[PDB]
Design a protein around this ligand. Structure first.
Ligand SMILES: O=C1C[C@@H](c2ccc(C[C@H](NS(=O)(=O)c3cccc(F)c3)c3nc(CCCc4ccccc4)c[nH]3)cc2)S(=O)(=O)N1
Length: 297
């Protein structure tokens, strides 16, 4: 994998490889997303879920939410990629997390980035001010949080007011991944990823983990592409067999625009190559990543 990486660097062809992916990427209808009554449920007019893979809310009224089920068959993992909820779709977001039985939510953006709103404040920041989503009959409470230098882990209690059943939902928030950019290093990205893996949130005993950034395609796609490729290297008999471009194209059959820049693609290569070290046995790379990620700053 590092041989191809190496030859792409030297050829200086990241942009070309990336454009080829854009050109070969699937293109399926998004009719429900584009219905006029669904307009205020989309943060960006040009980022929509494909009809075939969209997540349907269980409410009789309007079952629409800008979310997509990305089902990677060989790797055996599923993810839900969605936009940062809007003020009117926060109830919808937690309704999907409830109905889909998700256990963890991976947020890769900040509510405000460079002076622009990118996502609504859909979870409570204070223990004492829980949130109620009237339209969906759900209550959400912040139970605790572990704040690190570049990410935070939050324990949330989601409750179905109707049945009074409650669930523990884990929030994994990467606070330093710039829009249209990349993590500070493979180390802090992988550090974050394995923290999600180790929590149990990605276990097939739970519903799909819900991943999102602002549009649910650039940073979200980068996160999922690396996790899936690492899963494959640990599955197949020959880890060097993983073709990241093919995997990216497979992912794009489920949601449009996954990976938004040639550099995010190159970063994905670095994250996987680096992460392969741990998949092959190296027992010192994980701690090395933590140190390099300066999480205890
Ligand atoms: O790294 C990232 C990029 C963010 C991001 C990506 C895309 C958008 C959508 C945005 N729409 S508009 O209405 O502001 C907008 C801007 C320019 C032209 C236009 F008509 C509408 C956007 N779209 C493009 C270009 C198109 C990007 C794209 C490519 C394939 C599939 C889907 C979207 C660039 N920014 C917003 C944030 S993320 O939160 O997904 N993480």
């Amino acid at each position: 994998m590092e041989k191809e990486f190496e030859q792409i660097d030297k050829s200086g062809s990241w942009a070309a490889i990336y454009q080829d992916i854009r050109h070969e990427a699937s293109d399926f209808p998004c009719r429900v997303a584009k219905l006029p009554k669904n307009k205020n449920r989309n943060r960006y007019r040009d980022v929509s879920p494909f009809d075939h893979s969209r997540i349907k809310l269980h409410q009789e009224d309007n079952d629409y939410i800008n979310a997509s089920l990305i089902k990677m068959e060989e790797a055996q993992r599923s993810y839900i990629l969605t936009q940062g909820p809007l003020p009117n779709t926060c109830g919808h977001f937690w309704e999907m997390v409830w109905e889909q039985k998700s256990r963890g939510v991976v947020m890769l953006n900040r509510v405000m980035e460079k002076g622009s709103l990118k996502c609504a404040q859909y979870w409570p920041q204070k223990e004492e001010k829980e949130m109620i989503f009237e339209d969906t009959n759900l209550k959400l409470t912040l139970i605790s949080e572990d704040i690190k230098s570049y990410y935070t882990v939050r324990q949330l209690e989601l409750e179905n007011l109707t049945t009074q059943e409650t669930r523990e939902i884990l929030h994994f928030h990467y606070t330093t991944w710039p829009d249209f950019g990349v993590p500070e290093s493979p180390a802090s990205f992988l550090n974050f990823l394995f923290k999600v893996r180790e929590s149990g949130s990605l276990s097939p005993e739970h519903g799909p983990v819900v991943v999102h950034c602002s549009a649910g395609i650039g940073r979200s796609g980068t996160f999922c592409l690396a996790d899936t490729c690492l899963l494959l290297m640990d599955k197949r008999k020959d880890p060097s067999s993983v073709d990241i471009k093919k995997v990216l194209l497979e992912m794009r059959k489920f949601r449009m625009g996954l990976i938004q820049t040639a550099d995010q693609l190159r970063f994905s290569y670095l994250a996987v190559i680096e992460g392969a070290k741990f998949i092959m046995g190296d027992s010192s790379v994980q701690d090395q990543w933590k140190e390099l990620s300066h999480e205890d700053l």
